[PDB]
């Protein structure tokens, strides 16, 4: 079934990343300043599905940020969400840059990676 199976796992991953990002970007969080102190590491090259290893190794720091992201208006399930992400990556599946990334940049980078691979599969 892999023709639309791989495309669908990538779309599920994309929606999870996008939901986290929208939640951060839309609603006013009093903890935003603390969320922005969190340091994420970025792959040097992320072009193929193999490079999703580089995502898995930052899931522990991501889960922590997700605790900070819940509010009165943005609701989430950090543990379930991280588990789904780990599943999809481990199925569809590393050297970093010197530059650290914020959660916002981290999410945007991985969202764009997904969108490129998904444009390939259409």
């Amino acid at each position, epitope marked *: 079934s892999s023709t639309k199976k791989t495309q669908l796992q990538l779309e599920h991953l994309l929606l999870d990343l996008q939901m986290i990002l929208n939640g951060i970007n839309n609603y006013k969080n*009093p903890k935003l300043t603390r969320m922005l102190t969190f340091k994420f590491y970025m792959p040097k090259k992320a072009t193929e599905l193999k490079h999703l290893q580089c995502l898995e190794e930052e899931l522990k720091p991501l889960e922590e940020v997700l605790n900070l992201a819940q509010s009165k208006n943005f609701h989430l399930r950090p543990r379930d969400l991280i588990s789904n992400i780990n599943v999809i990556v481990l199925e569809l599946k590393c050297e970093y840059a010197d530059e650290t990334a914020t959660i916002v940049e981290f999410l945007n980078r991985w969202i764009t990676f997904c969108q490129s691979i998904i444009s390939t599969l259409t």
Partner: antibody, heavy 121, light 108 residues
Framework: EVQLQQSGAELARPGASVKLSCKASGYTFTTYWIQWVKQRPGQGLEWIGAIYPGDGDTRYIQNFKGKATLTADKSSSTAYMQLSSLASEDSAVYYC??????????????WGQGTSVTVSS | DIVMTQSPASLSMAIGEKVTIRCITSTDIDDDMNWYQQKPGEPPKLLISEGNTLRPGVPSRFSSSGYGTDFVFTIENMLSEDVADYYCLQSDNLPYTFGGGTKLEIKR
């Protein structure tokens, strides 16, 4: 095990600068924020700012922007705080201390022993 | 910023009595409260971290409660080893900020 050793007591004349140090052992010096805290004699604790040594990024409370300058040497596992334009209300004990988890701001568990700065003619 | 008002500034308690210190936050910190103990000439020691988490090695008669803006630190029964200053620290947003502290002395 995890240890933070601060430099010694300093005396400085009003207007000079001083550079305190904090040498860290027992953990990955690069993935933990290090916080700096001022304590005037007989008074309360006072948050100054923080540095992530992995890349030199810094945070400051507003009215210490310019007074304090945080730096780090990753080779030596050492952090530094420059204080500039010293007045008397800068006479205080300054601690460094490590956030209790990686990659992010947290409260501090491992503390230096403190460095006392006196600012007098 | 978020200010934290710690109260009382001073407290004296007979041995084995229960001790209560309060921190009130100028905004909603969602349980991001921490409690430190400082004895003279020493650096402050983290007693309780956010989520009412007792630190490893800390005596069990230390406890804390609170979610939102009103937080309480509790010693179940005063021992003389507990004479010290106690400070709370919010770790919810920047800037980090400390309460003004509490001087805890024993009665005799």
């Amino acid at each position: 095990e995890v240890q933070l050793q601060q430099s010694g007591a300093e005396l400085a004349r009003p207007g000079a600068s001083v550079k305190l140090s904090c040498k860290a052992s027992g953990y990955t010096f690069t993935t933990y924020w290090i916080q700096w805290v001022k304590q005037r004699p007989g008074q309360g604790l006072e948050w100054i700012g923080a540095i992530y040594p992995g890349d030199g990024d810094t945070r400051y409370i507003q009215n210490f922007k310019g007074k304090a300058t945080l730096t780090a040497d990753k080779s030596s596992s050492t952090a530094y705080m420059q204080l500039s334009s010293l007045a008397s209300e800068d006479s205080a004990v300054y601690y460094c201390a490590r956030s209790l988890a990686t990659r992010g701001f947290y409260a501090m568990d491992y503390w230096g022993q403190g460095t006392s700065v006196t600012v007098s003619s | 910023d978020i200010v934290m008002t710690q109260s009382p500034a001073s407290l004296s308690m007979a041995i084995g009595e229960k001790v209560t210190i309060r921190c009130i936050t100028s905004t909603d910190i969602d349980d991001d409260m921490n409690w430190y103990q400082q004895k003279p000439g020493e650096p402050p020691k983290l007693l309780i971290s956010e989520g009412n988490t007792l630190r490893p090695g800390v005596p069990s008669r230390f406890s804390s409660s609170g979610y939102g803006t009103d937080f309480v630190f509790t010693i179940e029964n005063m021992l003389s080893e507990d004479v010290a200053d106690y400070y709370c620290l919010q770790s919810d947003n920047l800037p980090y900020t400390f309460g003004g502290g509490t001087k805890l002395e024993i009665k005799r």
